[PDB]
Amino acid sequence: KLELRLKSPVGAEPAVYPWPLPVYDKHHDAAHEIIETIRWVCEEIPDLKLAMENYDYDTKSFESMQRLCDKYNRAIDSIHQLWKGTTQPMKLNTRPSTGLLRHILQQVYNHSVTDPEKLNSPEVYGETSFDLVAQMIDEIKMTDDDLFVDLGSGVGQVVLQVAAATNCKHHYGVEKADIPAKYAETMDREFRKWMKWYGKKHAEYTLERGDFLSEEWRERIANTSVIFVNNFAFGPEVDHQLKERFANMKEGGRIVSSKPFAPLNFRINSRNLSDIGTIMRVVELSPLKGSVSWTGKPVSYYLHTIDRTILENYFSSLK
Numbered sequence: 001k002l003e004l005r006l007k008s009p010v011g012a013e014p015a016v017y018p019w020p021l022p023v024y025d026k027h028h029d030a031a032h033e034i035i036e037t038i039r040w041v042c043e044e045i046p047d048l049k050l051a052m053e054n055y056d057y058d059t060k061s062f063e064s065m066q067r068l069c070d071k072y073n074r075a076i077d078s079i080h081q082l083w084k085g086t087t088q089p090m091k092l093n094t095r096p097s098t099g100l101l102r103h104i105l106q107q108v109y110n111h112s113v114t115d116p117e118k119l120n121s122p123e124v125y126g127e128t129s130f131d132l133v134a135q136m137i138d139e140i141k142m143t144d145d146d147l148f149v150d151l152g153s154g155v156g157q158v159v160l161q162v163a164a165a166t167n168c169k170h171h172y173g174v175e176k177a178d179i180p181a182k183y184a185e186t187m188d189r190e191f192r193k194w195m196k197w198y199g200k201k202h203a204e205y206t207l208e209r210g211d212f213l214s215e216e217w218r219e220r221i222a223n224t225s226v227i228f229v230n231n232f233a234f235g236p237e238v239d240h241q242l243k244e245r246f247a248n249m250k251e252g253g254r255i256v257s258s259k260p261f262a263p264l265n266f267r268i269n270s271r272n273l274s275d276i277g278t279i280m281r282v283v284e285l286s287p288l289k290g291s292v293s294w295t296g297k298p299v300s301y302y303l304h305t306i307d308r309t310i311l312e313n314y315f316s317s318l319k
């Protein structure tokens with residue numbers, strides 16, 4: 001029946017929406033996905049922006065929606081034309097800006113998480129931690145050297161965010177529970193599709209089914225240089241096993257978490273000598289003012305860097 005279609009700015013399969021356009025949740029529907037996508041594409045292509053200094057808008061009239069899609073598609077055609085002339089294509093494979101990325105990931109999520117219901121009351125998945133993760137990404141400089149892992153990666157959004165944002169040799173997510181691992185497969189597909197659609201590049205990444213305490217993971221963890229773990233509700237048993245597995249990490253390796261694995265007020269003495277606190281610097285990271293603020297209360301986060309010289313110094317300090 002009735003449809004709206006958006007042409008990709010790089011000639012990928014157009015995006016096709018049914019009318020009336022679905023609503024996703026109380027604060028998201030396809031209408032606004034459509035508008036937001038159009039706006040984002042104008043940011044990729046200043047030229048497209050120039051073509052469309054015309055658009056507030058009526059999202060419940062199909063006619064009003066279709067003029068918008070039409071103007072956009074037509075300007076797209078116009079742009080593709082320009083690129084046959086001496087004007088060169090928009091720089092091919094760049095990373096998406098943050099703004100675009102937040103959009104894309106919203107899009108991927110909504111197209112992948114059909115029924116946001118099979119996900120338990122409490123924020124045990126982190127639904128709007130995008131800005132938070134974005135902050136982390138800003139602070140923890142990463143490079144083609146690093147390997148990244150999100151321990152208990154959920155449906156994968158954080159892995160996708162980092163992979164989109166950084167140039168690690170590889171990013172990994174590992175998830176035990178079956179239903180989110182299922183969703184992650186679609187997330188993965190949706191993500192690849194939308195990134196092609198906007199013609200934006202991403203670092204290599206993999207989503208996996210697995211337990212991060214499983215024998216196999218001991219080795220991998222020791223090999224990972226950047227670990228993100230949202231351990232807020234892990235408690236005693238699991239924190240310990242993790243500390244265990246961290247102790248084998250190379251010098252420089254980083255762990256970013258919600259609960260600290262050492263303490264910050266930690267100075268090295270006779271009976272704390274096998275405490276992990278001896279092989280790692282720990283800092284409290286500044287929270288975001290607009291923090292999701294778990295437990296109706298402002299909460300911050302922790303960067304641990306594997307630094308053995310801390311130990312070495314305590315053996316130099318015995319002459």
Ligand SMILES: CC(C)N(CCCNC(=O)Nc1ccc(C(C)(C)C)cc1)C[C@H]1O[C@@H](n2ccc3c(N)ncnc32)[C@H](O)[C@@H]1O
Nearest residue numbers: 126152153154158175176177211212228229230256257258
């Ligand atoms: C709460 C966390 C741990 N996780 C979902 C979050 C998606 N990714 C995420 O939030 N990353 C992240 C976000 C923010 C931060 C900061 C705090 C900002 C630094 C750090 C990391 C839960 C998933 O972990 C899975 N989990 C728990 C243990 C378990 C297991 N041992 N092996 C496999 N997966 C397992 C569990 O099944 C859930 O699907």
